Design a protein around this ligand. Structure first.
Ligand code: SF4
Ligand code: SF4
Ligand code: F3S
Ligand code: F3S
Ligand code: FES
Ligand code: FES
Ligand code: NI
Ligand code: NI
Lengths: 634, 634
């Protein structure tokens, strides 16, 4: 019964092939882990010193307290804080790498990289207060890169990738609670300090630190988007495909997998120059396909088709047609290195701090990006040759995907209805009820949840209630693989008011049809694009984000990064659903802070709800409560 | 049978009082935790994403691998790396606070602080390459503080508090393996990134990252010592007392507890100015006593007596005479806040990122240090008044302690035997066998080990074999409370060769007697002083640290900080004993790297040995192997 594992029928087909071939999958490794530890599930375990491990019984008798005296409240809050810091360390490490890449590019140390989006560069400079008039673009870019790197440590200003991206009234609320980060890596380190043994031991104090570190994560996300747009271009609407059927038996199939596209954007361009070298090997060409966020990056900017996402990533290899999987970091199941020996795929790591035993490593350096890409693609061509004559099983399943909805692209699309006040048509339709509110789907799949089931169940209910739905990361991946990015499905999926708006915008953009049911705003760092859009709406209305009918749903969350994103969504003022249990239920006081009393600090709050129908109802209630607070019908 | 809990007879007495009064202690909370989780004990548990908790059976059947495919090797190495980063975050956060304090002092923003050790300031400037000739001391200090803060982030130089404190040949070895940190908080964040889900998954690669982060911890330790010496004075030999008998029923007893003495050095000076205000309340005066590292700081600089350490910290409160416990951060059992309600003690937190529910918080700001100290001490005086007429039970147990052996003080003491080559007398006596080698005892007590039993058992065996023993932190605390810092015990404890050397040095310093059996080199950050001494010996000999007959023992380790210290001791080239099991035994490959194949990278290695007699034999074998490598008899 593969339907209990994944709602994706291409994934189901490959699960059947993996089973008859004896290849263990993530779902098999989950089954072998059951029953999982209830102390860990509830957050009532601590290993922060060598007197541990400590645990607390959720209910009953002793143990009731950690060996040092740490209560359930403290243990739960410390664990959560460390998860937030780990997420911030990933998103911001990605951003730091892009900042170094931009600096190298404009210093003449990496000519494969350049300022591709001069407009974005100048707008970021203006937002940061960096002078542009009279200055060479390379010098403006050097100053932007230096400002990015400066936000990682303490200085005479707070983190500008927080304070310059949210409205002043929001910054004021956060400043009053001490929540503005002083420096990105500074906050990460302070979390690790305060959560170490014999330090912070007050749940509220710990959680305030967590909120501040989540804003350091937001800064890293926004910095990542900004720098990637400068270097690689701001996305605009594009049409492509998704799911395993985008693989081609006749081609060299190369997946780019990870989050930082610094090399894989180069993989894309170099691959086109090697079509003839691939043809000499008997292929039709090189077919680059995306997995996870780096796949989203190249989908958004170049229309590279998305193969699969998150929990089902191993299934691309099970087809037998994946000649190479080119990795950088984050969200890569290390099982890919052993599965590759069964499937023939060449798995290649490229970043010094992210290696996998058994996978080939090819150092990637920006300074040698083209040469390193050719080395990598030649391993892929050799692999294609080795499968001459072997049957492959690529499920003939794919969907049409319209994507590329950066915030700039959304504003441009709206400007076709109102050129000099582009946000007003959107606001007008919120006011008149054609758009009930906005929901951002974000985050991962999680093996505990039948793959995509929460995203699609919740999205269907919200769309029928006229909610404008936007999506990023593997939430966008789930929705795209089930047809939610195909405008042909607007009639089936969308309420009449939402359909009218999507159609009015689409027709004004010359499409002869609507925008798609869900707007793909990009990778997980590109959750920052949704922040930009919401902050622009807030500023246009003269209100703060916690008055807007905007919610978020990390419906199948997995990674520490998703915990960090959900926490900053709460911190900036949003009702934020999470569809898997974070390790908090072992402390009622912590749960009550995160789901209730944080409303009094930031106006946002977590909605923890594992039943997707119920979660949809709770998200709609949150949207409608915001409508009522604005005096609007609902 | 309290002897199974602590070998300290004052602690035993208070354990009897706690038992009859029904006050739960750390030992009771340990007993209530048994049996502890074997997955956590062995390191075979991962909670790095919301698909967990994952575990691996040490032996038997499934589960054999994490849900994402993470092997035992990966899980163990990731957990260890996070512990190292957490330790680095503590030591370096302490250092960062001191750097900000020095900057404020010389900018005229905090006149309670000043350059007290101008000689240290100029020597640090010279070591860092900061110009002094022609410059005002305040400007040199501003440049030192700015250099300290710069080492937290990437810049055009590596972390100078690594590269300028180790000999060039050691820096070259470490650079060749990629182990020199780029920035302190940079490395902490990169650890949290690389150990997050779907990132680094190669044990060797992970552990190399851990070694590099441990050097970021060393940098924070050395920076902490350097800045504390500038601000508060470099220690020189001092005589005081230790153990609970240093409390006085007739006085206001105030413990300073934590690690950062930035306020407690101020507590010491302000307390003397309030003797009359205390006398008006019916006390004889204010009796400041030390717990843990901040107690070590004021013991080393001012001869403040040490009350207790680490695992037994609650027992100071059980006497009934502890009127206040003034806290900043790290190693404070949060149980003190609840015990205080039973004992009458006022527990006071002072740092924004380290609060304890139920404890009074008094913001400490350097800018208002004196006024904030008086507010704190007045709460203590009020508490003393409330116990007018209540009997107290202070065990009449204390030892004499000679301490204050900074590296400068050790060199000065040796210079009385050889004025212009002060290290030569020490080397001469290593060569002739009067000193077999050097052992640094470091780190915490741990409730799993009868308190002090490993430190004293190992130290006794090494001293009888003519090993020069130095100590820091709660290792120094254990040894001082058992008489190892009293020169009257040299005859009983020391081999004939070591006694001859300690006597020759002492007589040349005019003491009419020897140096004490063990040299107290200070707090845990002051493990950096031992590095300075060993590096000076290495440079004097023209060899690297991994050829010297010098070892370390974290004989009863507890905190993540102790894991970080042990790891940098290995990274700089030392055989390093740990007397409690770190969570590594679930992976034989990781254990073999840490205890064997790391020798081929850094020349150091861990010695994991829970039996103290066996550990002493293994440490002596390590020392003697180094002697043999130098061509010396042993
Ligand atoms: S920090 Fe406290 S609760 Fe955590 S493992 Fe150590 S003794 Fe146990
Ligand atoms: S990172 Fe891997 S091993 Fe760890 S909890 Fe997540 S699925 Fe399990
Ligand atoms: S790339 Fe990763 S953080 Fe989640 S959104 Fe996808 S599994
Ligand atoms: S102050 Fe703390 S780090 Fe260990 S050495 Fe003492 S318990
Ligand atoms: S007791 Fe299972 S997660 Fe620690
Ligand atoms: S299963 Fe006990 S430490 Fe996780
Ligand atoms: Ni993601
Ligand atoms: Ni310590």
């Amino acid at each position: 019964r593969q339907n209990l594992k994944s709602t994706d029928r291409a994934v189901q087909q490959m699960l059947d092939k993996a089973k008859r071939e004896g290849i263990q999958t993530v779902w098999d490794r989950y089954e072998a882990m059951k029953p999982q530890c209830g102390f860990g599930e509830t957050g009532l375990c601590c290993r922060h010193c060598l007197q541990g491990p400590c645990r607390i019984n959720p209910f009953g008798d002793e143990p009731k307290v950690g060996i040092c005296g740490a209560t359930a409240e403290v243990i739960v809050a410390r664990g959560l804080d460390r998860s937030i810091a780990a997420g911030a360390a990933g998103h911001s490490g990605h951003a730091k790498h892009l900042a170094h890449t931009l600096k190298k590019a404009v210093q003449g140390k990496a000519a494969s990289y350049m300022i591709k989006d001069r407009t974005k560069l100048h707008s970021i400079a203006k937002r940061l207060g960096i002078p542009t008039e009279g200055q060479k673009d390379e010098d403006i870019a050097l100053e932007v890169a230096k400002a990015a790197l400066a936000d990682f440590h303490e200085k005479d200003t707070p983190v500008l990738w927080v304070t310059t991206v949210l409205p002043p009234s929001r910054v004021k609320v956060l400043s009053a609670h001490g929540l503005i980060p002083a420096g990105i890596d500074h906050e990460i380190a302070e979390i690790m300090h305060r959560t170490s043994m014999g330090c912070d031991a007050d749940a509220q104090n710990l959680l305030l630190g967590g909120l501040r570190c989540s804003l350091a994560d937001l800064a890293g996300c926004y910095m990542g988007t900004d720098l990637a747009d400068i270097l690689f271009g701001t996305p605009a609407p594009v049409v492509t495909e998704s799911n395993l059927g985008v693989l081609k038996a006749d081609a060299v199939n190369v997946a780019v997998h990870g989050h930082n596209p610094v090399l894989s954007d180069i993989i894309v361009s170099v691959s086109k120059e090697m079509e003839n070298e691939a043809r000499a090997a008997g292929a039709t060409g090189i077919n680059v396909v995306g997995i996870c966020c780096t796949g989203n990056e190249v989908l958004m900017r170049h229309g590279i088709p998305a193969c699969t996402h998150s929990v089902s990533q191993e299934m691309a290899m099970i087809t037998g047609a994946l000649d190479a999987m080119i990795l950088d970091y984050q969200c890569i199941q290390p099982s890919v290195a052993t599965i590759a020996e069964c499937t023939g795929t060449t798995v290649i790591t490229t970043m010094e701090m992210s290696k996998i035993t058994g996978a080939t490593h090819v150092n990637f350096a920006e300074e040698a990006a083209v040469e390193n890409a050719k080395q990598i693609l030649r391993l892929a061509i050799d692999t294609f040759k080795r499968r001459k004559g072997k049957p492959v099983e690529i499920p003939n399943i794919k969907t049409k995907v319209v994507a590329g909805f950066s915030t700039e692209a959304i504003i441009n699309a709206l400007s076709k209805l109102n050129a000099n006040d582009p946000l007003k048509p959107l606001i007008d339709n919120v006011v008149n009820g054609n758009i009930r509110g906005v929901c951002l789907f974000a985050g991962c799949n999680n093996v505990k949840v039948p793959q995509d089931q929460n995203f699609t169940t919740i999205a269907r209910k919200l769309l029928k209630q006229n909610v404008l739905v936007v999506a990023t990361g593997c939430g966008a991946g789930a929705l795209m693989r089930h047809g939610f990015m195909d405008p042909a499905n607007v009639d089936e999926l969308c309420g009449d008011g939402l359909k009218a708006v999507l159609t009015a915008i689409g027709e004004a953009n010359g499409l002869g049809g609507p925008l798609p049911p869900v707007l793909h705003m990009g990778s997980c760092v590109d959750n920052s694009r949704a922040v930009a859009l919401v902050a622009a709406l807030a500023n246009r209305l003269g209100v703060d984000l916690d008055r807007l009918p905007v919610v978020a749903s990390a419906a199948e969350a997995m990674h520490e990064k998703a915990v960090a994103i959900g926490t900053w969504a709460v911190t900036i003022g949003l009702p934020t659903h999470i569809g898997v249990l974070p390790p908090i239920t072992g402390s009622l006081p912590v749960t009550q802070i995160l789901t209730s009393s944080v409303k009094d600090i930031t106006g946002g709050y977590f909605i923890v709800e594992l039943d997707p129908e119920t979660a949809a109802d709770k998200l709609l209630a949150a949207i409608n409560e915001r409508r009522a607070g604005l005096g609007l019908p609902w």
